[PDB]
Write an enzyme that holds these catalytic residues in place. Structure first.
Site, mmCIF file in Angstrom:
data_model
loop_
_atom_site.group_PDB
_atom_site.id
_atom_site.type_symbol
_atom_site.label_atom_id
_atom_site.label_comp_id
_atom_site.label_asym_id
_atom_site.label_seq_id
_atom_site.Cartn_x
_atom_site.Cartn_y
_atom_site.Cartn_z
ATOM 1 N N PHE A 73 0.931 -1.220 0.030
ATOM 2 C CA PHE A 73 -0.023 -0.012 -0.040
ATOM 3 C C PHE A 73 0.883 1.125 0.219
ATOM 4 C CE2 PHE A 73 -2.851 -3.230 1.890
ATOM 5 C CZ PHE A 73 -3.982 -2.897 1.210
ATOM 6 N N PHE A 78 2.684 1.759 4.032
ATOM 7 C CA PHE A 78 2.834 0.532 4.575
ATOM 8 C C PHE A 78 2.341 -0.886 3.775
ATOM 9 C CE2 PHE A 78 -1.728 0.881 5.439
ATOM 10 C CZ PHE A 78 -2.131 -0.383 5.204
ATOM 11 N N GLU A 80 1.045 -4.784 3.848
ATOM 12 C CA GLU A 80 0.290 -6.049 4.629
ATOM 13 C C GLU A 80 0.629 -7.295 4.499
ATOM 14 O OE1 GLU A 80 -3.409 -6.522 3.146
ATOM 15 O OE2 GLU A 80 -4.290 -7.586 5.107
ATOM 16 N N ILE A 81 1.188 -7.914 5.493
ATOM 17 C CA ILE A 81 1.753 -9.271 5.579
ATOM 18 C C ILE A 81 0.292 -10.082 5.670
ATOM 19 C CG2 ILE A 81 2.920 -11.006 6.497
ATOM 20 C CD1 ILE A 81 4.519 -8.493 5.724
ATOM 21 N N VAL A 82 -0.046 -10.942 4.667
ATOM 22 C CA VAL A 82 -1.101 -11.828 4.512
ATOM 23 C C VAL A 82 -1.103 -13.330 4.924
ATOM 24 C CG1 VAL A 82 -3.025 -12.471 2.868
ATOM 25 C CG2 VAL A 82 -2.184 -10.164 2.655
ATOM 26 N N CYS A 84 2.317 -16.372 5.868
ATOM 27 C CA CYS A 84 3.659 -16.404 6.027
ATOM 28 C C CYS A 84 3.784 -17.727 6.738
ATOM 29 C CB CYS A 84 4.107 -15.388 7.240
ATOM 30 S SG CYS A 84 5.811 -15.361 7.618
ATOM 31 N N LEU A 116 2.458 -4.371 8.480
ATOM 32 C CA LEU A 116 1.124 -4.578 9.475
ATOM 33 C C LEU A 116 0.774 -6.144 9.081
ATOM 34 C CD1 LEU A 116 -1.326 -1.356 9.177
ATOM 35 C CD2 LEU A 116 0.455 -2.159 10.803
ATOM 36 N N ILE A 147 -6.254 -3.222 5.229
ATOM 37 C CA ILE A 147 -5.995 -4.705 5.760
ATOM 38 C C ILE A 147 -7.447 -5.472 5.935
ATOM 39 C CG2 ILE A 147 -3.875 -3.525 6.462
ATOM 40 C CD1 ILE A 147 -4.773 -3.880 9.202
ATOM 41 N N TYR A 150 -9.220 -10.563 11.323
ATOM 42 C CA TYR A 150 -9.504 -11.903 11.491
ATOM 43 C C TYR A 150 -10.065 -11.910 13.112
ATOM 44 C CZ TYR A 150 -6.694 -13.073 7.673
ATOM 45 O OH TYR A 150 -6.257 -13.061 6.467
HETATM 46 C C1 LIG Z 1 -3.071 -14.568 8.711
HETATM 47 C C2 LIG Z 1 -2.121 -13.552 9.217
HETATM 48 C C3 LIG Z 1 -0.568 -13.890 8.969
HETATM 49 C C4 LIG Z 1 -0.059 -15.076 9.186
HETATM 50 O O1 LIG Z 1 0.322 -15.976 8.558
HETATM 51 S S1 LIG Z 1 -0.188 -15.374 10.973
HETATM 52 C C5 LIG Z 1 0.746 -17.077 11.116
HETATM 53 C C6 LIG Z 1 1.935 -17.194 10.557
HETATM 54 N N1 LIG Z 1 2.366 -18.509 10.037
HETATM 55 C C7 LIG Z 1 2.150 -19.578 10.710
HETATM 56 O O2 LIG Z 1 2.077 -19.671 11.708
HETATM 57 C C8 LIG Z 1 2.597 -21.015 9.679
HETATM 58 C C9 LIG Z 1 3.020 -22.064 10.689
HETATM 59 N N2 LIG Z 1 4.164 -21.869 11.030
HETATM 60 C C10 LIG Z 1 5.464 -21.667 10.040
HETATM 61 O O3 LIG Z 1 5.166 -21.650 8.913
HETATM 62 C C11 LIG Z 1 6.826 -21.426 10.852
HETATM 63 O O4 LIG Z 1 6.601 -21.950 12.196
HETATM 64 C C12 LIG Z 1 7.208 -19.873 10.861
HETATM 65 C C13 LIG Z 1 6.335 -19.108 11.805
HETATM 66 C C14 LIG Z 1 7.008 -19.290 9.392
HETATM 67 C C15 LIG Z 1 8.459 -20.004 11.267
HETATM 68 O O5 LIG Z 1 9.603 -20.561 10.232
HETATM 69 P P1 LIG Z 1 10.950 -21.108 10.484
HETATM 70 O O6 LIG Z 1 11.662 -21.634 9.210
HETATM 71 O O7 LIG Z 1 10.717 -22.143 11.748
HETATM 72 O O8 LIG Z 1 11.635 -20.025 11.298
HETATM 73 P P2 LIG Z 1 13.305 -19.888 11.631
HETATM 74 O O9 LIG Z 1 13.927 -21.066 11.731
HETATM 75 O O10 LIG Z 1 13.850 -18.460 11.507
HETATM 76 O O11 LIG Z 1 12.986 -19.727 13.457
HETATM 77 C C16 LIG Z 1 11.992 -18.775 13.881
HETATM 78 C C17 LIG Z 1 12.488 -18.086 15.096
HETATM 79 O O12 LIG Z 1 11.706 -17.339 15.918
HETATM 80 C C18 LIG Z 1 11.502 -17.800 17.071
HETATM 81 N N3 LIG Z 1 10.226 -17.833 17.497
HETATM 82 C C19 LIG Z 1 9.736 -17.420 18.609
HETATM 83 N N4 LIG Z 1 8.395 -17.801 18.885
HETATM 84 C C20 LIG Z 1 8.055 -18.236 17.861
HETATM 85 C C21 LIG Z 1 6.930 -19.136 17.276
HETATM 86 N N5 LIG Z 1 5.579 -18.850 17.972
HETATM 87 N N6 LIG Z 1 6.944 -19.945 16.439
HETATM 88 C C22 LIG Z 1 8.036 -20.058 15.658
HETATM 89 N N7 LIG Z 1 9.018 -19.163 15.794
HETATM 90 C C23 LIG Z 1 9.205 -18.663 16.966
HETATM 91 C C24 LIG Z 1 12.347 -19.194 16.969
HETATM 92 O O13 LIG Z 1 12.661 -19.712 18.403
HETATM 93 C C25 LIG Z 1 13.562 -18.943 15.975
HETATM 94 O O14 LIG Z 1 14.529 -17.980 16.583
HETATM 95 P P3 LIG Z 1 15.742 -18.730 17.037
HETATM 96 O O15 LIG Z 1 16.465 -19.546 15.880
HETATM 97 O O16 LIG Z 1 15.313 -19.714 18.255
HETATM 98 O O17 LIG Z 1 16.563 -17.349 17.749
#
Ligand SMILES: CCCC(=O)SCCNC(=O)CCNC(=O)[C@H](O)C(C)(C)COP(=O)(O)OP(=O)(O)OC[C@H]1O[C@@H](n2cnc3c(N)ncnc32)[C@H](O)[C@@H]1OP(=O)(O)O
Length: 167
Positions: A73, A78, A80-82, A84, A116, A147, A150
């Site tokens: 936008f 800004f 918007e992260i949709v 991830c 955001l 944006i 949810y």
């Molecule tokens: C709809 C609104 C937008 C959204 O998508 S909200 C939902 C976001 N995505 C998801 O929940 C999808 C499910 N999860 C995933 O795909 C993955 O867990 C995610 C979040 C992409 C992370 O990918 P990775 O490749 O594991 O990331 P990475 O190896 O760089 O490590 C992440 C660093 O952050 C840290 N972290 C802290 N709280 C966390 C938490 N609650 N979940 C995941 N990681 C978390 C994690 O420890 C790591 O850091 P460090 O390596 O320990 O320093």
């Protein structure tokens, strides 16, 4: 090449014209759907293939292993992260961070210095690690009705610093 690749892709008009991009978009749709299992798959599919939305894709040996779907936008100042996600087998290697850093570099280049996003509770820490805060500085009038929201998720913001930190 046999190495990870970052491609910013999407549907400019119709996704049929470039089949490699189409296959990657389907891969993204499937990665987002599998890693965001409470999202309706049709909602994900619509947004991934929406021309106002781009996705930074992480590709390894022709296969999508993650991405960030976003909407810029520029007038608002800004992005918007949709969605991830990183595919589950490739998680916890640094890719999720690697993806967000790249996305930041891309936006600094486009002079957009705010993200955001809504976050579900159990993902908040990922965003916090990427420098997001629940304290929103972008005025509500700048994002309200721009944006997507949810039920029950937390709005978070990342302020980008274009200045290269050197100690
Ligand atoms: C709809 C609104 C937008 C959204 O998508 S909200 C939902 C976001 N995505 C998801 O929940 C999808 C499910 N999860 C995933 O795909 C993955 O867990 C995610 C979040 C992409 C992370 O990918 P990775 O490749 O594991 O990331 P990475 O190896 O760089 O490590 C992440 C660093 O952050 C840290 N972290 C802290 N709280 C966390 C938490 N609650 N979940 C995941 N990681 C978390 C994690 O420890 C790591 O850091 P460090 O390596 O320990 O320093």
């Amino acid at each position: 090449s046999g190495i990870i690749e970052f491609h910013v892709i999407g549907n400019s008009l119709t996704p049929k014209a470039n089949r490699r991009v189409l296959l990657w978009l389907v891969g993204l749709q499937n990665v987002f759907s599998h890693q965001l299992p409470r999202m309706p798959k049709e909602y994900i599919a619509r947004l991934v293939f929406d021309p106002k939305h781009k996705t930074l894709a992480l590709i390894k040996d022709g296969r999508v292993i993650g991405g960030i779907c976003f909407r810029m936008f520029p007038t608002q100042g800004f992005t918007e992260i949709v969605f991830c996600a990183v595919t589950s087998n490739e998680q916890v290697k640094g890719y999720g961070t690697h993806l967000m850093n790249h996305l930041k570099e891309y936006h600094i280049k486009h002079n957009i210095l705010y993200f955001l996003t809504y976050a579900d509770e159990y993902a908040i820490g990922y965003f916090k690690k990427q420098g997001f805060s629940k304290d929103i500085k972008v005025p509500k009038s700048r994002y309200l009705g721009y944006i997507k929201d949810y039920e029950g998720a937390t709005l978070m913001e990342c302020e980008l610093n274009p200045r290269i930190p050197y100690t």
